Write a protein that binds this ligand. Structure first.
Ligand SMILES: C[C@H](OP(=O)(O)OC[C@@H](O)[C@@H](O)[C@@H](O)Cn1c2nc(=O)[nH]c(=O)c-2cc2ccc(O)cc21)C(=O)N[C@@H](CCC(=O)N[C@@H](CCC(=O)O)C(=O)O)C(=O)O
Ligand SMILES: C[C@H](OP(=O)(O)OC[C@@H](O)[C@@H](O)[C@@H](O)Cn1c2nc(=O)[nH]c(=O)c-2cc2ccc(O)cc21)C(=O)N[C@@H](CCC(=O)N[C@@H](CCC(=O)O)C(=O)O)C(=O)O
Ligand code: NA
Lengths: 144, 141
């Protein structure tokens, strides 16, 4: 839809969002995440680390939402989906680290020392979060 | 705690945040809200409206969290609480509308036309949401 494309435009137009996961007690857990939006596949990809609260929540209940703010700093879009998570990075060139490399390119371009990047992924036990967008809602720029 | 004050400072330093309510199916519901923060009684105040999803959710389950961004746009603080809601504004002079007028003053001072403001609150079925902060976390700048 034109709408909603106005919401996706808010998502494709930014890189920082509020990730919302579900605590064991059922209430939301919120944090900021950097992301890359794949408009062709309608995916949102995030790099997260195994021992963080957001990761543990998602392994337990894969349902995730991301709110992205528009340029006006008023309006917003929220993407919902069911997260898919890679295993944590365990070797400097396993498929997980390879995917995180591709993610960092999409977000930040060419890395200074890729080999250190590779080692940090293993060390910090990084995970690729892939979130297929199954529903969008929000208040697109242009209305009340 | 030391950590605490740095987070609470983030909340004092802003007036828009992301409000998270809980949907019927257990999923968080997210939206931007404008708020006033009382650093004394440690509570957040928000003007919402009865017809909205966020309000329906909170009347079913009063747990709320609000995330607030630091100036660097990356650091942030989250406050959790159990929401307190007034009845919806029903008459231009009732207690709810008065509370919201006090809130509007705390946020943006004096309003152009209080009489149209009063009316708009009733037409909106506006609600005053009070969130005593029961817990804070996040990543201070
Ligand atoms: C600070 C922390 O955020 P985080 O998602 O763990 O990760 C921190 C960073 O990754 C993040 O700030 C970004 O900058 C990147 C956080 O949210 N802590 C919460 C914990 C919330 C939470 O979900 N706890 C789990 C714990 C689950 C368990 O026991 O392992 C739960 O309640 O189910 C809090 O202090 O209340
Ligand atoms: C859009 C809908 O959210 P809602 O709770 O009904 O709330 C319409 C909202 O846009 C509206 O209530 C507020 O977000 C507008 N709004 C404020 N609305 C307020 O109630 N209070 C505010 O202080 C306020 C400030 C504000 C600042 C920025 C901004 O972009 C919007 C702001 C929604 O979440 N739909 C979902 C979830 C439905 C559900 O939870 N059940 C869906 O369609 O899937
Ligand atoms: Na953590």
């Amino acid at each position: 839809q034109v709408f909603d494309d106005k919401l996706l435009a808010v998502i494709s137009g930014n890189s920082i969002g509020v990730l919302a996961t579900i605590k064991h007690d059922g209430r939301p857990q919120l944090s900021n995440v950097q992301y890359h939006f794949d408009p062709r596949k309608l995916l949102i990809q995030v790099s997260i680390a195994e021992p963080r609260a957001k990761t543990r929540n998602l392994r337990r209940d894969p349902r995730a939402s991301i709110l992205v703010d528009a340029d006006d700093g008023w309006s917003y879009a929220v993407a919902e989906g069911t997260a898919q998570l890679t295993p944590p990075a365990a070797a400097p060139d396993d498929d997980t680290v390879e995917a995180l490399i591709a993610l960092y390119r999409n977000i930040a371009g060419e890395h200074s020392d890729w080999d250190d990047y590779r080692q940090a992924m293993v060390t910090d036990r990084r995970v690729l979060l892939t979130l297929p967008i199954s529903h969008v809602y929000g208040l697109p720029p242009g209305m009340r």
